Motif scaffolding. Sequence first.
Motif, PDB file in Angstrom:
ATOM      1  N   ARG A  22     -46.960  -5.070  43.215  1.00  0.00           N
ATOM      2  CA  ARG A  22     -46.213  -6.042  44.459  1.00  0.00           C
ATOM      3  C   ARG A  22     -46.845  -7.218  43.512  1.00  0.00           C
ATOM      4  O   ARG A  22     -45.581  -7.989  44.566  1.00  0.00           O
ATOM      5  N   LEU A  23     -47.986  -8.020  43.553  1.00  0.00           N
ATOM      6  CA  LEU A  23     -48.104  -9.094  43.395  1.00  0.00           C
ATOM      7  C   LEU A  23     -46.858  -9.522  41.793  1.00  0.00           C
ATOM      8  O   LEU A  23     -46.554 -10.469  42.082  1.00  0.00           O
ATOM      9  N   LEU A  24     -47.044  -8.141  40.999  1.00  0.00           N
ATOM     10  CA  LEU A  24     -45.808  -8.573  40.039  1.00  0.00           C
ATOM     11  C   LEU A  24     -44.590  -9.076  40.213  1.00  0.00           C
ATOM     12  O   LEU A  24     -44.039  -9.586  39.958  1.00  0.00           O
ATOM     13  N   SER A  25     -44.134  -7.956  41.537  1.00  0.00           N
ATOM     14  CA  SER A  25     -43.318  -7.794  41.211  1.00  0.00           C
ATOM     15  C   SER A  25     -42.774  -9.448  42.286  1.00  0.00           C
ATOM     16  O   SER A  25     -41.751 -10.143  42.212  1.00  0.00           O
ATOM     17  N   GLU A  26     -43.481  -9.896  43.396  1.00  0.00           N
ATOM     18  CA  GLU A  26     -42.852 -11.639  44.348  1.00  0.00           C
ATOM     19  C   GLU A  26     -42.779 -12.030  43.200  1.00  0.00           C
ATOM     20  O   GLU A  26     -42.137 -12.863  43.629  1.00  0.00           O
ATOM     21  N   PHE A  27     -44.946 -12.751  42.659  1.00  0.00           N
ATOM     22  CA  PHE A  27     -43.951 -13.419  41.142  1.00  0.00           C
ATOM     23  C   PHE A  27     -43.156 -13.725  40.851  1.00  0.00           C
ATOM     24  O   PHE A  27     -41.671 -14.942  40.228  1.00  0.00           O
ATOM     25  N   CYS A  28     -42.343 -12.725  40.089  1.00  0.00           N
ATOM     26  CA  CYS A  28     -40.881 -12.443  39.239  1.00  0.00           C
ATOM     27  C   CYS A  28     -40.226 -12.864  40.047  1.00  0.00           C
ATOM     28  O   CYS A  28     -39.272 -12.888  39.313  1.00  0.00           O
ATOM     29  N   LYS A  29     -39.959 -12.660  41.313  1.00  0.00           N
ATOM     30  CA  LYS A  29     -39.006 -12.721  42.257  1.00  0.00           C
ATOM     31  C   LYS A  29     -39.645 -14.433  42.400  1.00  0.00           C
ATOM     32  O   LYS A  29     -38.431 -14.712  42.499  1.00  0.00           O
ATOM     33  N   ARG A  33     -36.039 -13.342  37.827  1.00  0.00           N
ATOM     34  CA  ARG A  33     -35.871 -12.628  38.576  1.00  0.00           C
ATOM     35  C   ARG A  33     -36.650 -11.307  37.980  1.00  0.00           C
ATOM     36  O   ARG A  33     -37.089 -10.615  39.125  1.00  0.00           O
ATOM     37  N   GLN A  34     -36.831 -10.528  36.916  1.00  0.00           N
ATOM     38  CA  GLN A  34     -37.771 -10.210  36.057  1.00  0.00           C
ATOM     39  C   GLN A  34     -38.208 -11.088  35.492  1.00  0.00           C
ATOM     40  O   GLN A  34     -37.046 -10.469  34.902  1.00  0.00           O
ATOM     41  N   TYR A  35     -38.832 -10.223  34.964  1.00  0.00           N
ATOM     42  CA  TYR A  35     -39.716 -12.116  34.132  1.00  0.00           C
ATOM     43  C   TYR A  35     -41.048 -11.305  33.121  1.00  0.00           C
ATOM     44  O   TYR A  35     -42.109 -11.223  33.212  1.00  0.00           O
ATOM     45  N   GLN A  36     -40.389 -10.393  32.179  1.00  0.00           N
ATOM     46  CA  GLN A  36     -41.653  -9.921  30.870  1.00  0.00           C
ATOM     47  C   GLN A  36     -42.586 -10.010  31.758  1.00  0.00           C
ATOM     48  O   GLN A  36     -43.500 -10.086  31.981  1.00  0.00           O
ATOM     49  N   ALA A  37     -42.911  -8.590  32.914  1.00  0.00           N
ATOM     50  CA  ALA A  37     -43.481  -8.275  33.689  1.00  0.00           C
ATOM     51  C   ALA A  37     -44.535  -7.865  32.641  1.00  0.00           C
ATOM     52  O   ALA A  37     -45.934  -7.456  32.359  1.00  0.00           O
ATOM     53  N   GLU A  38     -44.233  -6.763  31.194  1.00  0.00           N
ATOM     54  CA  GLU A  38     -45.127  -5.694  30.340  1.00  0.00           C
ATOM     55  C   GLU A  38     -45.981  -6.472  30.053  1.00  0.00           C
ATOM     56  O   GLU A  38     -47.485  -6.086  30.184  1.00  0.00           O
TER      57      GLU A  38
ATOM     58  N   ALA D  27     -44.467 -29.909  37.357  1.00  0.00           N
ATOM     59  CA  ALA D  27     -44.771 -29.909  38.778  1.00  0.00           C
ATOM     60  C   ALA D  27     -44.693 -28.769  38.534  1.00  0.00           C
ATOM     61  O   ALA D  27     -45.774 -27.303  39.375  1.00  0.00           O
ATOM     62  N   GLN D  28     -43.764 -27.950  39.157  1.00  0.00           N
ATOM     63  CA  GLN D  28     -43.338 -26.870  40.175  1.00  0.00           C
ATOM     64  C   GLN D  28     -43.618 -25.923  38.528  1.00  0.00           C
ATOM     65  O   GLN D  28     -44.207 -24.355  38.490  1.00  0.00           O
ATOM     66  N   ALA D  29     -43.230 -25.990  37.325  1.00  0.00           N
ATOM     67  CA  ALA D  29     -44.126 -25.348  36.236  1.00  0.00           C
ATOM     68  C   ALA D  29     -45.917 -24.521  36.437  1.00  0.00           C
ATOM     69  O   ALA D  29     -46.097 -23.440  36.012  1.00  0.00           O
ATOM     70  N   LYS D  30     -47.152 -26.175  36.547  1.00  0.00           N
ATOM     71  CA  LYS D  30     -47.803 -25.776  37.154  1.00  0.00           C
ATOM     72  C   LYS D  30     -48.192 -25.134  37.783  1.00  0.00           C
ATOM     73  O   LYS D  30     -49.411 -23.696  37.971  1.00  0.00           O
ATOM     74  N   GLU D  31     -47.747 -24.974  39.035  1.00  0.00           N
ATOM     75  CA  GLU D  31     -48.033 -24.145  40.340  1.00  0.00           C
ATOM     76  C   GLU D  31     -46.973 -22.881  39.810  1.00  0.00           C
ATOM     77  O   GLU D  31     -48.414 -22.106  39.967  1.00  0.00           O
ATOM     78  N   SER D  32     -46.503 -22.290  38.898  1.00  0.00           N
ATOM     79  CA  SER D  32     -46.074 -20.986  38.738  1.00  0.00           C
ATOM     80  C   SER D  32     -46.960 -20.408  37.831  1.00  0.00           C
ATOM     81  O   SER D  32     -47.719 -19.176  37.426  1.00  0.00           O
ATOM     82  N   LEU D  33     -47.363 -21.454  36.702  1.00  0.00           N
ATOM     83  CA  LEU D  33     -48.884 -21.012  36.089  1.00  0.00           C
ATOM     84  C   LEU D  33     -50.098 -20.310  36.748  1.00  0.00           C
ATOM     85  O   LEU D  33     -51.125 -19.878  36.427  1.00  0.00           O
ATOM     86  N   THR D  34     -50.483 -20.972  37.716  1.00  0.00           N
ATOM     87  CA  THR D  34     -51.304 -21.303  38.884  1.00  0.00           C
ATOM     88  C   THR D  34     -51.858 -19.950  39.330  1.00  0.00           C
ATOM     89  O   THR D  34     -52.254 -18.779  39.441  1.00  0.00           O
ATOM     90  N   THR D  35     -49.989 -19.655  40.494  1.00  0.00           N
ATOM     91  CA  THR D  35     -50.068 -18.270  40.398  1.00  0.00           C
ATOM     92  C   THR D  35     -50.037 -17.241  39.207  1.00  0.00           C
ATOM     93  O   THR D  35     -51.385 -15.989  39.946  1.00  0.00           O
ATOM     94  N   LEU D  39     -53.388 -14.596  40.263  1.00  0.00           N
ATOM     95  CA  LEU D  39     -53.379 -12.943  41.158  1.00  0.00           C
ATOM     96  C   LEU D  39     -53.205 -12.229  39.677  1.00  0.00           C
ATOM     97  O   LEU D  39     -53.536 -11.437  40.609  1.00  0.00           O
ATOM     98  N   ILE D  40     -52.423 -12.297  38.415  1.00  0.00           N
ATOM     99  CA  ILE D  40     -52.699 -11.702  37.826  1.00  0.00           C
ATOM    100  C   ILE D  40     -52.829 -11.691  36.842  1.00  0.00           C
ATOM    101  O   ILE D  40     -52.286 -11.591  35.158  1.00  0.00           O
ATOM    102  N   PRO D  41     -53.645 -12.612  36.200  1.00  0.00           N
ATOM    103  CA  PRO D  41     -54.495 -12.846  34.958  1.00  0.00           C
ATOM    104  C   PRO D  41     -54.987 -11.429  34.060  1.00  0.00           C
ATOM    105  O   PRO D  41     -56.542 -11.414  33.580  1.00  0.00           O
ATOM    106  N   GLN D  42     -54.431 -11.049  33.179  1.00  0.00           N
ATOM    107  CA  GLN D  42     -54.635  -9.266  32.643  1.00  0.00           C
ATOM    108  C   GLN D  42     -54.826  -8.361  33.337  1.00  0.00           C
ATOM    109  O   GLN D  42     -55.370  -7.121  32.677  1.00  0.00           O
TER     110      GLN D  42
END
Lengths: 78, 49, 43, 61
Positions: A22-29, A33-38, D27-35, D39-42
């Motif tokens: 879910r978190l992957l999908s929400e960020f990639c959106k 839109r689909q951003y190398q989630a692998e 700055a928007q790039a920084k926000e995306s990087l922090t997210t 949420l999904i650091p490995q």
Amino acid sequence: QPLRMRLSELEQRLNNQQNAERLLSEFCKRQGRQYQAEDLEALQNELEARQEALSLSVNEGGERRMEMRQELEQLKQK
Amino acid sequence: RQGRQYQAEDLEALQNELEARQEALSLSVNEGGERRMEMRQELEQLKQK
Amino acid sequence: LRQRHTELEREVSRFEDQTQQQRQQYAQAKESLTTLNRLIPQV
Amino acid sequence: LRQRHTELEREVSRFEDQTQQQRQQYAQAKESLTTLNRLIPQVTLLLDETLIDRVEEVREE
């Protein structure tokens, strides 16, 4: 009884898998839109490089713009 | 490393604190650098005067 | 203008010192955050 | 010198535009990087796209 504990643990594993999906999908959106989630570590590295670019760009722009403003002050006195 | 036990059982909250610190890091360093740079140029102007 | 140089150099020293200390402590905090969300991100 | 002032004003405009745009973009790039690193650091590697689908079998067992 062993299978009972196995079941509980596996249920938590499914929970975590859905959380990650879910978190992957929400960020990639949100970005892309689909951003190398692998394998997305490389994008983290490039974005850190772009933060370094942020520092460089902002410092260069500030110092240059203000230095040429001082040149404008010299021209004004002239 | 930071703190001694400092609620390690569920340490999510601390990350938000560190996020506020992280933003303030950019603000503080950017402003300080810009100020010192401004007076470096002013120093050059005084030197040239 | 030499007096102005002196005061300006003092101010430059103050800002450089302040930025150095600030960035050191804040960078240590940032590194702690990275260790948290790299080693134990709700792991 | 008034010609110089004119061209310098144009260059000031260019500097201001460039700095504003770059700071917003990064700055928007920084926000995306922090997210991402929040949420999904490995965590994706913990997921590993396994698709276990074995709770049904455990329920049958």
